[PDB]
């Protein structure tokens, strides 16, 4: 089970696709909810995501249907289509998924943020970095619900540099586009969701704290944070969760004026990647780094909760550290940082010490030696 949020607000969830095309925005929204008696949210909602994951895992295609059997009925603890909790303006996080992931697989993070009073928009990238995604070929196809699926692209050694960079730039653009969509919805523009879901977007009118905006993401999503910040000053700070820095162009490193927080796992990181993180550092800029003891790359994603301790450890989904312990640390430290750099008047400053990695399961900075 994916843990419930630790904050005082109940959490809701819905999907938004606008426009319907492959150039539209697709996001999963987590938000503070009015109601708590709704059905929980289906974690991986279509079979084609399992088919996609099977390609990403490099397994036999037929394993897709086995993954679907095993995980196709799992829910995540967010009230599906619950009304938005009215009467208060909420800061906004735009969230970027890793390679071979998609919008729904970081619900532990998104739900927790929501439960503390954030709206979270988890983008689904159309760069062929998702295991799968979908859209509609045209206006007609969206009416009858005739989905077109786009699957993960496999790269040759010789495309890696170039195509990963094209992808991160598209990702940044998709993050900025999602922001603009949400900000327009806030300023009351009628948006007809391309998905026919019982959730009126008019609810979101005057409900965003328009200047309190951050971008967060895991791995490929972490590079996406950094590209996004450099391109869009509307985002006021970023949190990169175990960032994979390879996609970034040489030009971006000196061009990130906003505060940036690296939350790393112990076992993923390596000198080449850490050196790149350190190229974001500069005497005039606000930079923080911590490393979660006993953690692996997958502690930041939902599949760290989907299996038992033993097969979890074997499959590199779980580390030595407990998965709830690990995510609590990442989520609480994230909240404190956001409070500091968005200027929120909440109680997240209780976790300030975690930004400095001052905790028995934290390492200040990095464990990786670079020389
Ligand atoms: C370093 C990465 C990489 C780079 C090149 C080749 C291979 C891997 C880039 C990246 O984003 N990574 C994280 C992928 O996290 C996932 C993936 C699928 C999932 F279902 C879930 C979940 N839950 C999480 C791995
Ligand atoms: Cl290295």
DSSP assignment of 270-330 equals: -HHHHHHHHTT--TTS-EEEEEETT--GGGGSGGGGSS-HHHHHHTTSS-SS-HHHHHHHH
CATH fourth-level superfamily of 1-371: Alpha/Beta hydrolase fold, catalytic domain (3.40.50.1820)
Distances (CA, A) of 176 to 128, 131, 232, 304: 18, 22, 7, 29
User: 213 is written with which tokens?
Assistant: 């905006």
The structure tokens 């295609």 sit at 61
3-state class (DSSP) for residue 218 = strand
Distance in angstroms (rounded) separating the CA atoms of residues 193 and 61: 32
Distance in angstroms (rounded) separating the CA atoms of residues 301 and 2: 10
Query: How many angstroms is it from 345 CA to the middle of ligand 1?
Result: 35
Q: How far apart are the first and last CA of the chain?
A: 41
Which residues have beta carbons under 5 A from ligand 2 (an ion)?
A: 270-272
Query: How many angstroms is it from 269 CA to the middle of ligand 2?
Result: 8
Distance in angstroms (rounded) separating the CA atoms of residues 293 and 364: 10
Cis peptide leading into residue 244 (ω within 30°) = no
User: Measuring from atom 4 of ligand 1, which residue has the nearest CA?
Assistant: 99
Distances (CA, A) of 24 to 28, 136, 157, 253: 14, 10, 30, 29
User: 291 is written with which tokens?
Assistant: 């490393």
User: Does residue 30 have its Cβ closer than 6 Å to ligand 1?
Assistant: no
Phi first, then psi: give them for residue 364, nearest 5 degrees: -60, 140
CB hemisphere CA count around 234 (13 angstroms): 18
The structure tokens 């301790």 sit at 309
Segments making up each domain of the chain, as ranges: 1-371
User: 311 is written with which tokens?
Assistant: 């097969």
Distance in angstroms (rounded) separating the CA atoms of residues 129 and 326: 26
Residue 78's closest CA among 50, 126, 49, 120?
120
Q: Which ligand is nearest to the CA of 268?
A: 1
Query: How many angstroms is it from 100 CA to the middle of ligand 1?
Result: 5
Q: Experimentally, how was this structure solved?
A: X-ray
**Number of the ligand 1 atom closest to the C-alpha atom of 56:** 18
Quote the strand ranges of the chain, DSSP E: 11-18, 25-32, 40-42, 75-80, 90-96, 119-123, 132-135, 148-151, 208-218, 237-241, 260-265, 287-292, 362-364
**What's the count of helices (H) and strands (E) in the chain, helices before strands?**
9, 13
User: 183 is written with which tokens?
Assistant: 């900000």
User: 65 is written with which tokens?
Assistant: 């249907």
List the Cα angle 79/107/327 in 5-degree steps.
125
- How many other C-beta atoms lie within 10 A of the C-beta of residue 29? 24
User: Does residue 240 have its Cβ closer than 6 Å to ligand 1?
Assistant: no
Q: Residue 117: which residues within 8 A CB-CB, separation 6 or more?
A: 7, 9, 32, 88, 90, 91, 346
Residue 354's closest CA among 310, 270, 290?
290
Query: How many angstroms is it from 129 CA to the middle of ligand 2?
Result: 23
Resolution in A: 2.1
Sheet with 208-218: list strands edge to edge: 40-42, 75-80, 11-18, 25-32, 119-123, 90-96, 208-218, 237-241, 260-265, 287-292, 362-364
List the Cα angle 92/300/208 in 5-degree steps.
5
Q: Residue 228: which residues within 8 A CB-CB, separation 6 or more?
A: 94, 96, 171, 172, 175, 176, 215, 235, 238
Distance in angstroms (rounded) separating the CA atoms of residues 206 and 228: 25
Query: What would you report as the CA-atom Rg of the chain, rounded to the nearest whole angstrom?
Result: 19
Phi first, then psi: give them for residue 219, nearest 5 degrees: 65, -110
Q: Residue 211: which residues within 8 A CB-CB, separation 6 or more?
A: 236
Q: Which ligand is nearest to the CA of 52?
A: 1
């Amino acid at each position: 089970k994916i843990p419930r949020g630790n904050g005082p607000y109940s959490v809701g969830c819905t999907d938004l696709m606008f426009d319907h095309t492959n150039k539209g925005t697709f996001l999963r929204l987590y938000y503070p909810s009015q109601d708590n008696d709704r059905l929980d949210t289906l974690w991986i909602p279509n079979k084609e995501y399992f088919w996609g994951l099977s390609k990403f895992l490099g397994t036999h295609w037929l394993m897709g249907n086995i993954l679907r059997l095993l995980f196709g009925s799992m829910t995540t603890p967010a009230n599906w289509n619950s009304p938005l909790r009215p009467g208060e303006k909420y800061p906004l996080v735009v969230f970027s998924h890793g390679l071979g992931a998609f919008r729904t697989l970081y619900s532990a993070i998104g739900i927790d943020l929501a439960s503390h009073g954030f709206i979270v928009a988890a983008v689904e990238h159309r760069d062929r970095s998702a295991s799968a995604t979908y859209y509609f070929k045209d206006q007609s196809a969206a009416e009858i619900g005739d989905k077109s699926w786009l699957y993960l692209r496999t790269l040759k050694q010789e495309e890696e540099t170039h195509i990963r960079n094209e992808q991160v730039r598209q990702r940044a653009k998709e993050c900025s586009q999602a922001l603009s969509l949400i900000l327009d919805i806030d300023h009351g523009k009628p948006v007809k969701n391309a998905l026919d879901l019982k959730f009126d977007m008019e609810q979101l009118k005057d409900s965003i704290d328009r200047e309190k905006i951050a971008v967060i993401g895991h791995s490929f999503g972490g590079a996406t944070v950094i590209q996004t910040l450099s391109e869009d000053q509307r985002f006021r700070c970023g949190i990169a969760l175990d960032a994979w820095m390879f996609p970034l162009g040489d030009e971006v490193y000196s061009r990130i004026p906003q505060p940036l927080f690296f939350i790393n796992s112990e076992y993923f990181q390596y000198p080449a990647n850490i050196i790149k993180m350190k190229k974001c550092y500069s005497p005039d800029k606000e930079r923080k780094m911590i490393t979660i003891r006993g953690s692996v790359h997958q502690n930041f994603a939902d599949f760290t909760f989907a299996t038992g301790k033993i097969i979890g450890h074997m499959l590199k989904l779980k580390g030595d550290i407990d998965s709830n312990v690990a995510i609590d640390l990442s989520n609480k430290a994230s909240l404190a940082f956001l409070q500091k750099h968005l200027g929120l008047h909440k109680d997240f400053d209780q976790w300030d010490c975690l930004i400095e990695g001052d905790d028995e399961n934290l390492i200040p900075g990095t464990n990786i030696n670079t020389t």
